[PDB]
Amino acid sequence: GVGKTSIARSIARALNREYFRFSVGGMTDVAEIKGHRRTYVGAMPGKIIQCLKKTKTENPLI
Amino acid sequence: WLTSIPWGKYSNENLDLARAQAVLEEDHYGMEDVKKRILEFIAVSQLRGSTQGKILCFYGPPGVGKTSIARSIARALNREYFRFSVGGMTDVAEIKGHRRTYVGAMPGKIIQCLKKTKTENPLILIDEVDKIGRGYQGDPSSALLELLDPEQNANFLDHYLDVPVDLSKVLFICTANVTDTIPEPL
Amino acid sequence: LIDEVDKIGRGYQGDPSSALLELLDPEQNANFLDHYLDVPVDLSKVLFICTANVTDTIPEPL
Amino acid sequence: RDRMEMINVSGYVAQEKLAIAERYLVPQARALCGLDESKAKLSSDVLTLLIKQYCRESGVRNLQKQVEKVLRKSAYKIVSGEAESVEVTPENLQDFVGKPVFTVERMYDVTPPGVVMGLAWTAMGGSTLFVETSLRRPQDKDAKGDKDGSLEVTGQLGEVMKESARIAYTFARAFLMQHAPANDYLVTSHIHLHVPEGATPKDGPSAGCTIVTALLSLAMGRPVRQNLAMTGEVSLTGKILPVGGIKEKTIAAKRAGVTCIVLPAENKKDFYDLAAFITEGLEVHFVEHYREIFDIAFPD
Amino acid sequence: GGSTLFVETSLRRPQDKDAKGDKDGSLEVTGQLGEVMKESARIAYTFARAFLMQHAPANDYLVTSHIHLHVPEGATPKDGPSAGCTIVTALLSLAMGRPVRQNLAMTGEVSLTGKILPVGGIKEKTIAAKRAGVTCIVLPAENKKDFYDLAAFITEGLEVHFVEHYREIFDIAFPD
Numbered sequence: 168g169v170g171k172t173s174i175a176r177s178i179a180r181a182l183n184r185e186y187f188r189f190s191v192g193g194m195t196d197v198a199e200i201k202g203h204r205r206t207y208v209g210a211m212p213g214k215i216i217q218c219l220k221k222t223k224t225e226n227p228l229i
Numbered sequence: 230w231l232t233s234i235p236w237g238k239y240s241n242e243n244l245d246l247a248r249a250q251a252v253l254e255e256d257h258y259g260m261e262d263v264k265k266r267i268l269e270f271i272a273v274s275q276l277r278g279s280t281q282g283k284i285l286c287f288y289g290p291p292g293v294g295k296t297s298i299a300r301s302i303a304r305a306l307n308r309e310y311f312r313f314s315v316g317g318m319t320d321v322a323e324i325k326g327h328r329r330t331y332v333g334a335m336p337g338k339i340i341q342c343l344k345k346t347k348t349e350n351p352l353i354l355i356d357e358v359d360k361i362g363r364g365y366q367g368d369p370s371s372a373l374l375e376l377l378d379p380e381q382n383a384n385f386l387d388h389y390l391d392v393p394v395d396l397s398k399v400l401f402i403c404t405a406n407v408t409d410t411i412p413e414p415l
Numbered sequence: 416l417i418d419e420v421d422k423i424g425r426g427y428q429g430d431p432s433s434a435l436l437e438l439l440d441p442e443q444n445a446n447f448l449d450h451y452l453d454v455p456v457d458l459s460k461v462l463f464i465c466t467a468n469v470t471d472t473i474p475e476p477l
Numbered sequence: 478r479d480r481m482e483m484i485n486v487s488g489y490v491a492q493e494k495l496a497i498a499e500r501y502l503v504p505q506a507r508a509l510c511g512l513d514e515s516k517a518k519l520s521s522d523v524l525t526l527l528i529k530q531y532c533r534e535s536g537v538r539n540l541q542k543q544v545e546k547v548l549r550k551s552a553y554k555i556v557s558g559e560a561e562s563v564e565v566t567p568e569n570l571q572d573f574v575g576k577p578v579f580t581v582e583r584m585y586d587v588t589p590p591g592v593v594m595g596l597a598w599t600a601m602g603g604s605t606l607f608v609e610t611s612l613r614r615p616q617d618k619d620a621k622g623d624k625d626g627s628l629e630v631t632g633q634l635g636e637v638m639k640e641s642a643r644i645a646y647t648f649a650r651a652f653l654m655q656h657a658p659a660n661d662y663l664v665t666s667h668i669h670l671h672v673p674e675g676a677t678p679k680d681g682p683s684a685g686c687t688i689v690t691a692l693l694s695l696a697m698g699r700p701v702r703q704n705l706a707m708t709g710e711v712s713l714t715g716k717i718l719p720v721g722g723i724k725e726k727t728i729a730a731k732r733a734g735v736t737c738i739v740l741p742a743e744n745k746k747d748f749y750d751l752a753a754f755i756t757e758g759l760e761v762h763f764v765e766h767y768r769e770i771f772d773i774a775f776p777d
Numbered sequence: 778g779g780s781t782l783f784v785e786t787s788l789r790r791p792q793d794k795d796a797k798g799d800k801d802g803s804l805e806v807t808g809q810l811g812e813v814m815k816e817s818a819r820i821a822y823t824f825a826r827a828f829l830m831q832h833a834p835a836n837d838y839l840v841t842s843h844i845h846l847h848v849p850e851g852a853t854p855k856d857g858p859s860a861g862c863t864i865v866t867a868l869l870s871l872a873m874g875r876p877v878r879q880n881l882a883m884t885g886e887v888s889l890t891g892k893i894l895p896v897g898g899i900k901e902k903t904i905a906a907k908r909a910g911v912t913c914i915v916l917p918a919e920n921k922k923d924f925y926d927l928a929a930f931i932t933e934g935l936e937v938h939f940v941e942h943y944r945e946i947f948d949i950a951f952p953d
C-alpha cells in the first residue's frame with residue numbers, strides 16, 4: 168500500500184504504453200507462465216500470451 | 230447462451246429507505262450493523278445515480294441466518310437472488326467454465342446465474358469460502374480475486390464464452406465462520 | 416435408498432459427495448440435472464433413505 | 478535479484494499521509510461517492526486523529542477504507558438524515574467511525590529492567606519490538622557451583638539468529654567481566670529471552686545490540702532509559718556494524734514516540750540522508766563501539 | 778463461535794523426590810498444540826515462576842515439580858495464545874492449592890512479564906461466558922472499548938474486570 172502498483176500505472180500512462188500486472192507471488196507451476204504443451208484437453212498458453220492478446224500491443228508495461 | 234445473457238438489462242432496484250428498513254426489520258432481528266451498512270449502501274447508490282455493486286462478507290458462526298439475511302436483502306432491494314458453494318472445490322472451471330469446444334461444455338456458474346436472473350444487477354451469495362481446498366488443478370483463489378477485483382471484474386470472461394462481461398453492479402456476499410484460513414488477498 | 420454412505424472414497428476425479436449434496440439439497444434438488452441430460456428435475460416429493468453403520472465418518476456437509 | 482536495481486518505497490509520514498489523503502485520496506473517494514466539498518467537509522484534525530488512532534501501518538489502504546466508510550456514512554446522513562451538509566469534527570468522528578482503534582500501542586512506556594525497544598525493518602514496513610530477557614532459574618543454583626548460565630531463547634529462531642544470540646551472549650559476558658567483574662549474574666544464571674517476529678532474516682542481526690542491552694539491564698537491574706531506541710550488530714568485540722532499512726526504522730521510531738536513538742556511524746549519512754521533518758523531535762546518537770551505548774543507556 | 782474450556786493442571790511426579798534435589802520441574806502439555814502454542818505455554822510458565830518468586834520465594838512447589846497441563850482444543854490458532862493468563866492462574870492455584878474464585882473467567886496473552894495484550898472475538902466469548910453462568914470476567918483494559926460496543930441487554934450480571942498487568946489478575950483471583 169505505498170503505490171508501487173500506482174507508480175507503475177502512472178509510468179505506463181506517462182510513457183503512453185499499456186499497463187498490466189502479473190501476480191507471481193505464491194506461484195510455482197512454471198506452466199502458468201509457459202502454458203501447456205497444447206495437447207492436454209483445453210490447454211492454454213503462457214500468461215504472457217494472454218497479456219499480449221489483451222493489450223493488442225507488443226510494447227506494453229509489464 | 231450468449232443471447233440469453235441479459236445485456237444492459239437491470240432490475241428496477243428498490244430505492245426507498247423506509248420500506249427497505251421495514252422489510253429488513255420484519256425479516257430478521259438484530260444485525261443492526263448489517264442493516265446499517267446495507268442501508269448506507271442503498272443511500273449512496275441513490276445518491277450515486279446509476280446502480281452499483283460492491284463485495285462484502287458476513288463472517289460468523291453457523292445457524293446465524295447469513296443466507297436468510299442475504300435473501301432478505303435480495304428481496305428488499307428488488308434485485309434477483311442466487312447462491313454459490315465453493316467449499317472444498319478444486320476445479321476453476323465451475324467459475325471460468327469450460328473451453329466451449331467439447332460437446333456439451335458448460336459455462337461458468339456466474340453465466341448460468343445471469344441467464345436465470347435475467348438481469349445484470351442480481352445478488353450473488355458465495356458460501357464457505359474459507360473451506361476452499363485449492364488443490365491440484367485448482368487454485369481458484371486466483372479466479373476468485375479475478376472475479377472480485379472491482380476494476381478487472383468489469384471485463385471478466387469465462388473460458389466457454391470468451392467475450393467479457395461487466396460485474397460493477399452485482400452484489401457478491403461471502404460467508405465464513407473464521408477470517409484466518411481465507412486467503413489474505415481476498 | 417443409498418447404501419453404505421460411510422464407505423465413500425472421495426478420490427481423484429471422484430468426489431461424488433458434491434453430487435450427493437446437490438441431489439439432496441432441499442432447494443437445488445428441485446432443479447437437479449446431470450451431464451448426459453441437461454434438464455432440471457424436481458425431487459422434493461421423492462423420498463430419500465440412507466444407510467451407514469457409523470455416523471462419525473459421514474462427511475459433515477452430508 | 479542481481480539482474481535489476483532495487484528501489485525502496487519507504488512509506489509515508491503522518492503529515493505525508495495527511496497531505497496525500499487531503500490532496501489525492503479524499504477527493505478521489507468524494508468523486509467515487511459523488512459528494513461535493515460543500516456537502517462533504519473534512520478538517521485536518523479529524524483526519525490526523527483518524528491516522529493516529531483508527532489506523533497504524535506503513536501502508537495507506539486502511540486509511541482509504543476509513544475515509545470511504547466515513548464518507549458513505551455522511552452520504553447516508555445527507556440522503557436520509559437531517560444534515561444537508563456534513564461538518565466533521567473529532568467530536569462527531571466517534572459516531573461516524575466509532576471508538577478509537579489504536580492507543581499509543583507502545584507495549585511499555587517505562588521499559589522495566591531486561592526489556593528494551595528495538596527497530597526492525599519488517600516486510601510490511603517497520604516495527605518496534607520489545608526484546609525481552611528473563612531469568613529462568615534462580616542464580617543461587619548452588620552457593621559453590623559455578624555452572625554456566627545456559628541461556629534460552631524463543632521466537633522461531635533461525636540459525637543466523639541463534640548465532641547472533643550466542644555471540645551477543647558471549648560479548649555481554651565479556652563486557653560485564655571487564656566492567657563489573659564482581660558480578661556473576663550473567664555468569665551463573667539460566668536466562669531466557671524472546672525476540673518478536675517481523676524482522677527479515679537479513680535485518681535480524683540488527684537486534685544484537687538490543688539483546689546485549691537487555692541482558693546487561695537484567696544483570697544489574699537498572700531499567701533502560703525511557704523513550705530510547707537502539708539497533709545494531711556486533712562482531713564479538715563490541716564493534717557496531719551497518720544495517721539496511723534505516724528510514725523505515727526511523728519512521729516507526731517517530732510513530733513510537735521514542736525521542737532518543739543510537740545508530741551506527743556508518744549509516745550516519747543515511748540518517749542524514751532523510752528529510753529534516755522526518756528527524757524532528759528525535760536526538761540521534763551515532764556510535765561505532767558498544768561502550769558508548771552503555772553510558773548512553775546507563776548515564777548513571 | 779465461542780466456547781468455555783477448563784484448562785487443567787496435574788502433578789505427574791511427587792513434589793519432593795529428594796529435598797536436596799535441584800532439578801527443574803519439567804512441564805508437559807496437551808491440547809493438540811501448534812508450535813506457537815508451545816512457545817506461548819513456555820512463556821506462561823516462565824512468568825508463573827517469576828511471579829511466584831516475586832511473591833512466594835519460600836514456595837518451591839512450582840520450581841521443583843514436574844507438572845502436566847491440558848488445554849482443551851477447538852480454538853482457532855489465532856486465538857490460542859489468549860490462554861496465557863488462564864495458564865498462569867491455573868499453575869499458581871496448583872502451586873498454592875488455593876481454588877480460583879468461583880464463577881470467575883479470563884482470557885488473554887501475557888508478554889512473559891504479566892502485561893496483557895488484547896485479544897479478538899470478545900463478543901462471542903462473553904456470550905458463551907454468560908451461557909457458562911460466570912459472573913466475574915477479567916479482560917484487558919485495551920479490549921474494554923470492544924466490550925462497551927456491546928448492547929446493554931447482553932452485559933447484565935457481568936462483573937467485568939479490566940486489567941493491563943497480571944498483579945491485578947492475581948489479586949482479583951486471590952482475594953485471600
Ligand SMILES: Nc1ncnc2c1ncn2[C@@H]1O[C@H](COP(=O)(O)OP(=O)(O)O)[C@@H](O)[C@H]1O
Binds near residue numbers: 170173497
Ligand atoms: N503517494 C501516493 N499518492 C496517492 N496514493 C497513494 C500513494 N501511495 C500509496 N497510495 C495508494 O496505494 C494504493 C496502491 O498501492 P500499491 O501500488 O498497491 O502499493 P503496494 O504495491 O505496496 O501494495 C492506491 O489506492 C493509492 O491510493
Ligand SMILES: Nc1ncnc2c1ncn2[C@@H]1O[C@H](COP(=O)(O)OP(=O)(O)O)[C@@H](O)[C@H]1O
Binds near residue numbers: 290292404
Ligand atoms: N435473527 C434471526 N432472525 C430470523 N431468523 C434467524 C435469525 N438468526 C438465525 N435465523 C435462522 O437460522 C437459519 C440458519 O440459516 P443458515 O443458512 O445456516 O445461515 P448461517 O450460515 O448464517 O447459519 C435461517 O434459516 C434463519 O431463518
